Symmetry: C3
Subunit: 191 residues, 3 copies
C-alpha cells in the first residue's frame, strides 16, 4: 500500500528540489517519504559487495556486473517500500556521447515495480539559461533543440516504463518563478 | 485469419463514431466486425468472476486482482477473434490526476495479441472546442498544450504496444468537416 | 567486446551512405565492421529453411513463420558479433498502408542484444525534396507532416528498443551539404 514513485528530469530542471519541498510539506501531514538516488543505491550495493571503494570506480565496472548491481539496487529499493512511501531520484535517460541511455532498463523495472513515474520539465530556453548560470557545471554548447530532443526521448522512455509496469506517467512543469506551483502539483501526486 | 484491431483516441476525438461507420460499410461487403470496449469486458470478467458488484468502485480495487482481471479480459477478447474480426475500443493512455495510465500494459498485450493499433487524432484546438460544446461534460481547465501532451504520450505508448506485439500502429486524423475521409481511411485498414 | 549497432532512418535520409563512409574511415584504424541488412538475413534464413526461393515470396509467409524467421535472423546476426563489430541496416518502423510496422519486435531484440540504436534524421522538407529528385521512386508523395510523423514514431520505437535491451539510442542529423559532419559523428559512435 506504500507508493514507490520515480522522479526524473534532465539536469538543471530541479526535480530533486521540488521533491525535497513536497516531502517536507507531506511530513507535516504524517506522510513520511524516504528519498533515494538510484545511482547512490547502486554505489551502496557495490560497496556492500566489495566491488568498489569510491563512487568514481562505478563507471569502470563491466556491463554484466552493472546489470547485476542494477537488479540488486531495484530489489533493495522495492524492500524499502515495506517501511514507508519511497521516492527514487534518477534519470529517464542519460544523454551520453553514444546516445540516450535508459535509466531504468526492463530488468530494473521488473525488480522496482514502480507505481508512478514523474517527468519534471520546463522549456529548453529555461534549462539552457539555468545551466549557464550554474558555476559548478561546465560549458558544453548543448542547444535548446538538444535539450528538447532529450525531453522528447525522456517522455517516450517514461511512457515505455509505464507500459511495462502499469505505472502512471505524470508530467509536471517546473517553470522559473513558479516553483511553488510545481511543488503543489507534486504533493497531490505523492499523497 | 480474423484481425484483432485496437482503436484509441483522446476523449472528444470521435474514434468510436468513425469505427461504427466503418463497420457498417464493411458489413455491406460481408466483413462483420464485433466491437467491444476493454473496460466493459474487464467489468464483465470481474462480474463473471464475482470479484465486484457495483461497477463504480472498480477504480478502488486491489492492484493484484485488477492485473488478474486485465489478463482474463485480454484472453476473453483473444477467444472472440476465432468467431469474427474484432475491434477493441480503449484508450492508449487515460489522463488521470496521477498521470497517463496505460490502457494496455504488457500483461494485457501478451493475452490480446493485437494485429493493428489505431490512434485517432485531431488538433488540440479542435478537441478543446469539441469538449467545450459537449453538454455531457464538466468544464475542467485542460489546455491545447495538455491535449497535445496526451496525444504525444498516446503515440509513444501505442508505438511501444507495436514493438511488444509486432502490431502495426496506424495514425488517422479525424478532422472537423472531414469525417468521411477518416471513415474511408479506417475502412481500408480494417478490411 | 565487439559492438552490435543498428542504423535506422526513413527512406531517403541516407543512413546506409553515411554508414558505409564511416566504416571505410574506421578500417584505416584497423576496425573492420561487417554491415548486414536485416531483411536480407531473414531472406537467407528462409532460403536455408526451404520456405522460399526468391525474395518476392517472403511477404506471403504466414505471421508465425515470419516470427520464427525473425528470431533465427536475430540469432544469426548475434553470432556474427563474435567475428567482428556488426552494423545492422534496418528500419525502426516501416510506414505501411496498415500503419508503422516495428522493424525489431521484442522477440528480435531478445536475440540481437544490440549495444546502440542509431536514428538518422533530417527535416521533412529535405527528405521530401530528396525523394522528388530520386528517379528510382514513384509518386504517392508523402507530405512533410507525414515524414515528421514517421520520424516521431521511429524515435519512440527506437527509445522502446533501448529500454528493452539497455542499448543507447543516438540521433544523428544527416543534413543536405553537411554529410561529412554526419559521417564524423557516426565514426565517433561506431568506434
Ligand atoms: Mg470512449
Ligand atoms: Mg534502406
Ligand atoms: Tb553525476
Ligand atoms: Tb533450421
Amino acid at each position: 500500500k506504500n507508493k514507490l514513485v520515480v522522479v526524473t528530469g534532465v539536469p538543471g530542471v530541479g526535480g530533486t528540489t521540488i521533491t525535497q519541498k513536497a516531502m517536507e510539506k507531506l511530513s507535516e501531514e504524517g506522510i513520511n517519504y524516504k528519498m533515494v538516488n538510484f545511482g547512490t543505491v547502486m554505489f551502496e550495493v557495490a560497496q556492500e559487495e566489495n566491488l568498489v571503494e569510491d563512487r568514481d570506480q562505478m563507471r569502470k565496472l563491466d556491463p554484466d556486473t552493472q546489470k547485476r548491481i542494477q537488479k540488486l539496487a531495484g530489489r533493495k529499493i522495492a524492500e524499502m517500500v515495506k517501511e514507508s512511501p519511497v521516492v527514487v531520484d534518477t534519470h529517464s535517460t542519460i544523454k551520453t556521447p553514444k546516445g540516450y541511455l535508459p535509466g531504468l532498463p526492463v530488468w530494473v523495472l521488473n525488480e522496482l515495480n514502480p507505481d508512478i513515474i514523474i517527468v519534471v520539465e520546463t522549456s529548453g530556453d529555461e534549462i539552457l539559461i539555468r545551466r549557464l548560470n550554474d558555476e559548478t557545471r561546465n560549458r558544453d554548447l548543448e542547444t535548446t533543440a538538444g535539450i528538447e530532443e532529450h525531453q522528447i526521448m525522456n517522455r517516450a522512455a517514461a511512457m515505455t516504463y509505464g507500459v511495462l509496469t502499469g505505472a502512471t506517467v505524470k508530467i509536471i512543469q517546473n517553470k522559473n518563478n513558479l516553483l511553488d506551483y510545481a511543488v503543489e502539483e507534486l504533493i497531490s501526486v505523492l499523497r
